[PDB]
Design a protein around this ligand. Structure first.
Ligand SMILES: *[C@@H]1O[C@H](CO)[C@@H](O)[C@H](O)[C@H]1NC(C)=O
Lengths: 101, 103, 103
């Protein structure tokens, strides 16, 4: 049999993605999501985001994978600016206001 | 304890390469991680295919390294075994006329 | 000058593979150039990573080829050395009763 072991509470993703105001890209406030259980299937099912992108994880496998701490960066940039920031790609956003490892 | 080094060296080198062969499991080999499942649980398969190659190509090579070592090393033992079987036959079972073959 | 070919062959084959091993540095192995810095000079690293793999994978393999050759070749010498040490002990130090072992 399969015996997956997890340590529940609730993760406040709704506050992060539905904050009336978003911080500027150059200066942003890190938010710590911890001591809670997070479901990524509901976020994918809602599909509120115009596009779902995962450089690291797969969105379907996000539920299977476990992450001890979830940190969210909230910023507003143009759609072309979103394209500039990518792993292995140099972008104007990457050069000054924000950097992605 | 150094008289038996010849034996002791054989046993070590065997256990040596095994350790090395094991530690090769934990190497990235250019892949994103050394845990075969993480590449599967942190990457949609179509890309993860290319990743697992670098693991497989790395590991699969790393066996041929180990295997080739054993073949070569066994071929030494195979030579040493005949030396024994020669002594055992000539020296023990008979009396050797070969100067300094028996010591 | 051909009587010493046995020795002369050993020395050559050693210097042979070394030349080959060196010349492998100048091969592209699918990478854009054989100079490790040029790949770093021309290209931004994120892509140059994949390039240097083809150099490393190529070169790193090219060592194991050379190393494996030496192991195999040494195992021959290791066999020839015992033949000497056998002759030196039996033939020189003693007198050999083995027909045509000493010539
Ligand atoms: C954010 O708002 C959208 C639209 O109302 C909703 O579908 C989503 O569930 C909200 N946030 C989360 C991730 O709960």
């Amino acid at each position: 049999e399969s015996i997956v072991r997890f340590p529940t509470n609730l993760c406040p993703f709704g506050e992060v993605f539905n904050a009336t105001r978003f911080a500027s890209v150059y200066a942003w406030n890190r938010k710590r999501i911890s001591n809670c259980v997070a479901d990524y299937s509901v976020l994918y099912n809602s599909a509120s985001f115009s596009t779902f992108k995962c450089y690291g994880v797969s969105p379907t496998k996000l539920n299977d994978l476990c992450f001890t701490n979830v940190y969210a960066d909230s910023f507003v940039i143009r759609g072309d600016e979103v394209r500039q920031i990518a792993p292995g790609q140099t972008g104007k956003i990457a050069d000054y206001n924000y950097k992605l490892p | 304890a150094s008289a038996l080094g010849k034996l002791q060296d054989v046993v070590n080198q065997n256990a040596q390469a095994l350790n090395t062969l094991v530690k090769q499991l934990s190497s990235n080999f250019g892949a994103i991680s050394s845990v075969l499942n993480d590449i599967l649980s942190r990457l949609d398969k179509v890309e993860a295919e290319v990743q697992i190659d670098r693991l497989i190509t790395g590991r699969l090579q790393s066996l041929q390294t180990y295997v080739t070592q054993q073949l070569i090393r066994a071929a030494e033992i195979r030579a040493s075994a005949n030396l024994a079987a020669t002594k055992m036959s000539e020296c023990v079972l008979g009396q050797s006329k070969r100067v300094d073959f028996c010591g």
